[PDB]
């Protein structure tokens, strides 16, 4: 690059946008994530590095609630990730105010992806340094899960992972047999996969933030009860 990798408005000689090619590197460097579409819902999971024990119980959590039934598991530059989560919350609120009911996940993912692409198109603004999964469930549309790269577009995922170790997580994700496994065992298995991914081999101790959406929660994307999912973390440990 050298000369062409200064602003996103400058195309590469081969026809590439090196600003986003570098923004993807921040996502590749930040801690990983995972989201699996269970048979009747979607289960999230993210390891968060407790950089210092001075911090309280899990804060700046990689999980977010963008709408009543929709959750966002994000990785990458966390401040811009939170700003984008606020953008998604505003988009969901606006859609609910205008068209009523709840925003379908495919349309929400498409709109937030178009907003992210608007931020990577220009020169004055810079591409977002974050990649996130949007997971939701409803009785009508089942469970959906869309993943958005820092510059790419939403894609339907049965199971997806992002962050430091995408391939290592995805191998065991594809090893796992989804589409017939209930969200409970999927919660056990996502923690198992995260613990299989390196946590303290080169880093500090990690916390297990896991999220729910499904008919077992009648929609209503909420963080899994951590007190009762500590045993799921224990099964992951074994």
């Amino acid at each position: 690059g050298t000369g062409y990798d200064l602003s996103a408005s400058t195309f590469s000689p081969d026809g590439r946008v090196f600003q986003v090619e570098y923004a993807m590197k921040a996502v590749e460097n930040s801690s990983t994530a995972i989201g699996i579409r269970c048979k009747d819902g979607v289960v999230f999971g993210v390891e968060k590095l407790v950089l210092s024990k001075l911090y309280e119980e899990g804060s700046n959590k990689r999980l977010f609630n963008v709408d009543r039934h929709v959750g966002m598991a994000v990785a990458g530059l966390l401040a811009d990730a939170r700003s984008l989560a606020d953008i998604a919350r505003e988009e969901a609120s606006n859609f609910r105010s205008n068209f009523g009911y709840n925003i379908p996940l495919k349309h929400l993912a498409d709109r937030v992806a178009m907003y992210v692409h608007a931020y990577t198109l220009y020169s004055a603004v810079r591409p977002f340094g974050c990649s996130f999964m949007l997971g939701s469930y409803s009785v009508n549309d089942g469970a959906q899960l869309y993943m958005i790269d820092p510059s790419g577009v939403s894609y339907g995922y049965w199971g997806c992972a992002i962050g430091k170790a995408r391939q290592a997580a995805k191998t065991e994700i594809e090893k796992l047999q989804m589409k017939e496994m209930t969200c409970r065992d999927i919660v056990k298995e996502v923690a198992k996969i995260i613990y299989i991914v390196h946590d303290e081999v080169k880093d500090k101790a990690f916390e297990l933030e896991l999220s729910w959406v499904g008919e077992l929660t009648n929609g209503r994307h909420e963080i899994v009860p951590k007190d009762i999912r500590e045993e799921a973390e224990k099964y992951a440990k074994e």
């Binding site: 609630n65 963008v66 709408d67 009543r68 919350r89 609120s93 609910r96 105010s97 963080i223």
Partner: protein, 216 residues
């Protein structure tokens, strides 16, 4: 906004020991017309706060949408906090005052009931931004008819029990149906308590017409 077309009639509510009960009939008065007889004028603000309104039902629906959206946004953050019914009453008060200042008033008189921190709260806000809290509240002709009974009950009994409170509310609804042109014999009664907000549904009051034989 400027001239309501479909108006909702009176709503009332009283607080008791450990909870509050409000009641609104299910009639949307298109002037002198009983156009809509199966509409709910009571909204669940959250798990521990209820709200009813009297007046333009379109304005009530707009306020319901906005307030539900802001409650959803508040609960999305997952900070453990919530919009206390006192805060909700203040927010509605400010909204009505801002609309009046902009000279686009919201043709609704609203009663906000809640039970948080183990203490019952029962707010009141009108179109002109006048707000306060009282143990018993009523709107429109309800404040003329049902309110005196509540005041005379509360003067001798500063505190109330839930069963006799809802019986008193039912009697006040009967009185309002008897002597209000815009009233209807189908009212919803919503009770807020420590367990949450429970709405009974299309309750009806029994009418007495023995005095009809006193015409001659």
């Amino acid at each position: 906004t400027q001239n309501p077309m479909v108006t909702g009639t009176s709503v009332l509510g009283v607080k008791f020991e450990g909870g509050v009960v409000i009641a609104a009939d299910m009639l949307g008065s298109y002037g002198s017309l009983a156009r809509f007889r199966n509409i709910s004028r009571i909204m669940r603000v959250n798990n521990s706060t209820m709200l009813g309104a009297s007046g333009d039902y379109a304005d009530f629906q707009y306020l319901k949408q906005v307030l539900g959206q802001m409650v959803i946004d508040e609960e999305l953050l997952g900070d453990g906090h919530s919009y206390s019914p006192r805060a909700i009453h203040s927010w509605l008060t400010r909204a009505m005052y801002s609309r009046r200042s902009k000279m686009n008033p919201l043709w609704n008189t609203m009663v906000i009931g809640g039970y948080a921190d183990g203490e019952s709260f029962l707010g009141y806000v009108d179109m002109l931004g006048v707000a306060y809290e009282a143990p018993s509240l009523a709107t429109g002709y309800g404040a003329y008819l049902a309110q005196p009974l509540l005041r005379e009950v509360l003067e001798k009994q500063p505190v109330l029990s839930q069963t006799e409170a809802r019986d008193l509310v039912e009697r006040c609804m009967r009185v309002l149906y008897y002597r209000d042109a815009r009233s209807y014999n189908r009212f919803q009664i919503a009770t807020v308590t420590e367990k949450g907000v429970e709405i009974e549904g299309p309750l009806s009051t029994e009418t007495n017409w023995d005095i009809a034989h006193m015409i001659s």
